[PDB]
Amino acid sequence: MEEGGRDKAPVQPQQSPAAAPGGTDEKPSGKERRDAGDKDKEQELSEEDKQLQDELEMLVERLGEKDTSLYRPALEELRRQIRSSTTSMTSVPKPLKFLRPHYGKLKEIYENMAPGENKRFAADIISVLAMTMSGERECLKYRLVGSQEELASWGHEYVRHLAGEVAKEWQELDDAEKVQREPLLTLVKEIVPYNMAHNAEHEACDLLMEIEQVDMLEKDIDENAYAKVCLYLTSCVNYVPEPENSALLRCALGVFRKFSRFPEALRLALMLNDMELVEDIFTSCKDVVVQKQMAFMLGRHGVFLELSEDVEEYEDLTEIMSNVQLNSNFLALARELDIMEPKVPDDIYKTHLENNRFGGSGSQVDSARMNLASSFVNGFVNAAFGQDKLLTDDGNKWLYKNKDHGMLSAAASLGMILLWDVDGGLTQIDKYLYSSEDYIKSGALLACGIVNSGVRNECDPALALLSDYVLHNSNTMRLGSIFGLGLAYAGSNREDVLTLLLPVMGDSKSSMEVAGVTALACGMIAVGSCNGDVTSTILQTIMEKSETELKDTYARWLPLGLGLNHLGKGEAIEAILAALEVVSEPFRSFANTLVDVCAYAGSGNVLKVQQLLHICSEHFDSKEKEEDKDKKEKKDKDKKEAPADMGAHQGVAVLGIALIAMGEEIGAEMALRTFGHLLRYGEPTLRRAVPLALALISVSNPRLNILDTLSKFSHDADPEVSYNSIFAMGMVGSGTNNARLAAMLRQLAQYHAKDPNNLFMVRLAQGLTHLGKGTLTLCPYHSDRQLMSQVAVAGLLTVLVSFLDVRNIILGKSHYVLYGLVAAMQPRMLVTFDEELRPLPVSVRVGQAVDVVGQAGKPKTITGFQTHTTPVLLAHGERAELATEEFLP
Amino acid sequence: KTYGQSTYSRQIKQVEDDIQQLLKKINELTGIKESDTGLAPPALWDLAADKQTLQSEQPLQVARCTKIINADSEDPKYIINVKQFAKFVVDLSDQVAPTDIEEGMRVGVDRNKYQIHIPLPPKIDPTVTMMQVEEKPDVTYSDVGGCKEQIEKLREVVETPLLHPERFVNLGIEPPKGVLLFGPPGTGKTLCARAVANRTDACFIRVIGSELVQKYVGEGARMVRELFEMARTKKACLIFFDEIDAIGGARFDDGAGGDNEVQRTMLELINQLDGFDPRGNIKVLMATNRPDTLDPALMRPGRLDRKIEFSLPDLEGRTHIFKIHARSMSVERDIRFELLARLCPNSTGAEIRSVCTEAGMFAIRARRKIATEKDFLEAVNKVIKSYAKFSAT
Amino acid sequence: TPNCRVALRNDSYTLHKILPNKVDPLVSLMMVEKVPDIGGLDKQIKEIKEVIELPVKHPELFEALGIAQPKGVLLYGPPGTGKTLLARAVAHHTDCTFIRVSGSELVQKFIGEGARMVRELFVMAREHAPSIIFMDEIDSIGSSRLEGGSGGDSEVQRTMLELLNQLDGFEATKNIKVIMATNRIDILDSALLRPGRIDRKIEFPPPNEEARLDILKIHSRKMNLTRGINLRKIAELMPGASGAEVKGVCTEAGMYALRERRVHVTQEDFEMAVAKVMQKDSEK
Amino acid sequence: ASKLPLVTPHTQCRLKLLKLERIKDYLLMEEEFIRNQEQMKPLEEKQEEERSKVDDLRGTPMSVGTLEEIIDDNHAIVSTSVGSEHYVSILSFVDKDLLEPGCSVLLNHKVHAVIGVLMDDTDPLVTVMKVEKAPQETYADIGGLDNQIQEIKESVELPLTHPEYYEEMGIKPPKGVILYGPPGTGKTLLAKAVANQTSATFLRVVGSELIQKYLGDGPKLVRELFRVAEEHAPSIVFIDEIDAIGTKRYDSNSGGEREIQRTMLELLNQLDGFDSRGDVKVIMATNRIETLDPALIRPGRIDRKIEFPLPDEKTKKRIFQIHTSRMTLADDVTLDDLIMAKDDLSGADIKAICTEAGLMALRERRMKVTNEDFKKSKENVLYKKQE
């Protein structure tokens, strides 16, 4: 404790500052020159961030409280001369002379008045005098004033200029780290009116720095991972023009302004498609911006590139629609055949070879329904790229043997065989078509739409499945003919043929299991804020289901075609439109929870989550709205995959404690679809916790629910070491978990991961985290999986080709115009970085290094090295163009 | 007392904290059985405690492990010891194929009838299991700038034949499997080791030079046996030694009662390195600070082929290392380092990082966000004078 | 209680009855507290009077100057040399309950009770009365430092670590001291025990004529002797004689009384015993 | 327990407020939904049903075994107390996370299956080497050090206490610290002082104890030392007296000296060779400083070399005042008689003085203090240095 003798600051600034009645009066040099000399001594000595207890900042205030208390809070004759060296050293050490209630009266000391500007003497500062003061303003005072009456006198005018200097001031001491701290000021300042702050912050950033656009930019998107309902709406459209005005990246326009297409209104990114047609700069970044526009997050954008520029800068359109899709063909065309793919691996039905030597002899498993899974040994494995000439003779005999829905099934696996095909997919179907069969014809033809899906080249706009539908007096001629064209034309929202199949629902002909999948199929073309098909459906709903609703074939298929396409929207109006037309009773009100959160896919609304559990938790009303709470928990399944890790940990904490530990029918029947929709890559946490409720099937229930969860627990990153789990559960499931209902199921899930050994992308995630269909096609399976004989008759149409919106797998590709390059890549882990510093490592697993077609994987954000020039997009996406250049290598 | 550094300073802090504690209070409120002397929490073994543990009970017996000696003619007729129990003439169970039961094998056999059930992985002790790195630190080749000749020479040896076993066949040559590194300390050898191990694409094996000296005779050699065994097993694996001076530096015999055991061990490394049926696909990287007092047997080529050294940067290696250790840190846009390196005529990359991190300590003590450029000026000044009147120098 | 026998089943190994211990081995080998009642040893007596008799009678002095009263003591000299019994008496001079600790090697191997042989000993010291404890070369012979460290711990240096575990407490001696006398003083961990724990050592100079005379009576004390003898002449017949050796002198004289065919320990016996004992002392 | 990994803002960003408010509302929702379980159907079929069922499934006579190897998922190889090694499968009941080789286990009688695991003991090494508690006086015991205290503080204390400067720039702190100067300076004082006022573990090490009659353990002691210090907790390692054990290769001889060269070698590579230790504080004490190995001297290993000067008449008046604070003092004495006379006397010498008073006055059993007590005491220490 070395004090006393050297407390000059605690003496001269403790005497002259003390006697203002003696200093301000009767001593002009005493009030003026000693206070000014205490303003350069305190501004230069007690005014910078240096420690807790400065020579003055803590020491001149210990008795400097009353010392400051009467030097100039009370003279009542203040002039335009005694405001520079009078509020001169009393004003700076204010925040620690007073106490925590300084936020209400934080305007009398340094918010009172500075001599000219905050930087006139707060340029030699970090945050003590003026910076943290200004933050203390915009925290509380500008909010309470800016709630209702902003423009009063001085809490807005001086604030207007102060915000411009504080904004660049976060980058001013050093344009480096608290750059992102500035959005703590622009966001906390006028939370709702963020565009009022980002309106000046946008151009101030436009003049801020060319190199300083991307990190505070990614901090804007950082604060746009989720915000207040009016802030995710606002700061996202704020987020767009930064790479448009100051920076010029503009290849994250098409996909990362799909960030800002739907959350604002209907037409914003169609005017941003016009933005594409206005930003007609060099065609490599243009070409790859438009690459995603067909089969990477959306399609049907091929009626806007046929203007006068149709030479190459508008001839990129059809290249996107089917030609670059044809390079998706060549992907396995010349890459997977060369690397790792013969047409028929056939090692799933053969990898189950050693099991016969455990327990003695075999040949006891002779269940015919297992042959249903026998079709998927060919169906899944050829799922996109691969054919079979008499390699399908098992479906040749079993197709001509029994199991009519097995004829539809085996006929349906052919489209999975020839997927992403336009050349001969119909030529394959034609031979196996002329057999006088409804399941075979309606299955292969329905598979044809699977074949031309995302193509948009002429395959059958009205040729194949329209002619299939025009003979529909009956079975899956009437039933499955409408499914394949909606599947094929889901990515391309053509309204005409959907109007052709609107009379499918408007017919009112007996469509027991045909009408629900009708609204599902035409909904595949265009449902979701469905203007016409929601109409034609729930007209027939108020006609028939108003008077009969027993099974989920009626009730469980219509509301899906109320609000299931536009699950990327968040406006919540179509819940009002479609919902209010069916506001009758509880059973017809099972749809009430459908479109409510079907406009709530992923975002920040934990208050919507508490209204997602607290209303209907258990309630035990003796089996009346148990399905209502089952579906309400079903809507707990979304808003957990893309709140960006926010909903995941709390969903695993909640589900791991409530349902499986102490739960009800809701948990013992359906509670695993949260994992059948939540994760798609697989990790040891759920990968072990699920079989803790899976190996123990709890068959007292309709055990094919835990067996249903068996299937979609194989939903993880394609191949894994989980063959131990699935294989062992197939051995214990040989006798137990009878093959009469599970023999197709166990190998069904066994083979799903290992189908073409790649190609699982329906996660509603692209690039790093945005959205993209993945729900119209995936979801109807998990909704179609309740428990029982919907795996028997009605199910075989959906269960086979329910979800087919998988967009390949990987990104290792060159596409330099000749397409010969093999540029040195370097596989790693997903980029975990948001903000730590400037020299911050993008990934960690730098060990692996590849050059050509490889493995994307779920958590991977590979960049590469050597600067062979990745100028096309620099934001990934698996068909980079590689504009080559020697940028000082 | 304090101030509000960012607007709602405690307003997020205690709000986070009390719900964090409420996470606990949920758990103790619901009732959690903790500290049951080494078990699992009941939430996940309640639905695993069923007969799907008897599936591990009855289908899998005790399976006592034993060791194989030899076989016989026309039939297995296997001769096996248990470990210390007794030696028997036993036979395999029908669950196995009479192919992968070769001699010197650890195999699981029934306790009742003494029939072989399972082939096992051979034995490998923890003392060497722990020196296998099993991980690759993130050390990029760019971080080792300033030794362009050295990294090239090493690249020609440990990298090019492996990743491109084509040129050496098209010309008909053999790569020099034996590399030694040396030079003054604090220079870029370790860094080179970690970086090569980064892109190692191989079973890289650390070796600490003093780990071999032991209390009993020959046991250290017994280490070396397991070393070259795991090497020959793991195809295309790398070995690193470090300060091998402890091993076999000389053959002091004027008064032959000094060091002999690690001399014998060094001889074992001699034989199991080269001589009598060479190893095949293995690469050896060494490094020492005094490569002057070593037994010339290691100095013979074939074993220690290349002698790469790391020197002291004249003026420009220190510049580039200013670009290496000064890059991964926060500074103003007013950089310049030639002025710096012209001020430090003799300093290593390690001292370069010392000046870069010492740069931050001023703003760190002076309550600043980042190391401003001028603050870095102050840093190099205090390290110019500090290194000028340094304690040892 | 830990370290106790129990009746066990053979089928389920269920406890039947907690069988009683034999005897607490330290409690059956409980060190003697006999009645604490030396030509050659008088100068060091003062040194132990100041290293013991001072802080005991004078808490308030080293409290007044605030200095740790010396409790740990060390002496050094030829073998035995009254190191034992001088401590035995200094423990009594202030009524401070001598606590012998032979513990030479018989307690060093005892692994089970080696974690308590110090504990309940010191509890004895603080329970009986003001009590002085004495140590000797035993620890110096058993373990010194980490030499027998990582390679087995030797079961002894650890118990020493419990010793320092207790000395690193709060006593200020109060009136209690602990003496120690050992050869091989350059091996132990006295570096740690210097500050506060233990303190100086005092030397042994050789004995003298009247010294070995009074020794001669005190060690011819439990015998059957004769008058008509200048015993002073006898102690004067051994110029270069140590202490304990005088005890063997008395034993030799008793031997000569044995060969004299009588129980009278006469002057013949000592006059020859000086010659024989010294004759055995004739090698260097 | 690992409820949310994100700490990326490192500020009061509204991002973080949204994060912790969301996580808050989620936790409240879980606590309430589970709260409505004991409301509609408060039941207790999950405490002694599963516990009792498995307590009876597993066995009594809980034979203690030893882990040998880990294979796949459920079967591992174990070793009985005598050597009988069994290829036994484990249950999903023991913590699979705390299951590593060289660990005691619980086994069955018939199948000998792994039932449970026994928690490990506290190794004797920590008890031997670690100064268990705050041993000695706090910062009221300094005679004088301010730049020393600054260097060691911002090198260790300021980093751990306020780790909000190093992660602003991403700059890591200096690693090694050499405390050197003339003997009797107070190196032990400052080491035991920071050990007193500290929050992480502390270790004290002597160098003379690194010589075995067994051959070549040495670096065994080193490696196990740093192993325990690292594995244990945030570790503050302190090694005093490395000067008489690690100086340099003076003649490159053999026979014990070569052994010490190997040992300090292992303290070098083990000091910092590979995969940087992390949370491994290292502090080294030396008397001399020139006869040290510069390979250890270079950066990476030690970044702060602190000199220990000897004050002359300014802090000595507080050193005599501290060593005379807890003692009587007659009015016949004046500390300036001896403080105002010499200008290099070590604090160890002031200690021998203020203790020599306690020897002199109470050897004679006189009253509190006399000036000749400090006279004869100071002269006595004068012969303590001079002789």
Ligand SMILES: Nc1ncnc2c1ncn2[C@@H]1O[C@H](COP(=O)(O)OP(=O)(O)OP(=O)(O)O)[C@@H](O)[C@H]1O
């Ligand atoms: N050219 C350089 N570039 C970057 N860092 C360097 C350079 N030279 C030295 N260093 C730094 O100095 C330290 C010493 O380097 P290195 O460990 O390779 O020397 P060494 O020879 O292994 O040390 P020793 O000889 O003491 O075993 C390294 O940790 C490294 O970060």
Ligand SMILES: Nc1ncnc2c1ncn2[C@@H]1O[C@H](COP(=O)(O)OP(=O)(O)O)[C@@H](O)[C@H]1O
């Ligand atoms: N400034 C001081 N104030 C108080 N005591 C001191 C001072 N300087 C030295 N000493 C005493 O001198 C002794 C020397 O300590 P230290 O330098 O650690 O020993 P060594 O030099 O043998 O390592 C300390 O134990 C302390 O009691």
Ligand SMILES: [Mg+2]
């Ligand atoms: Mg090295």
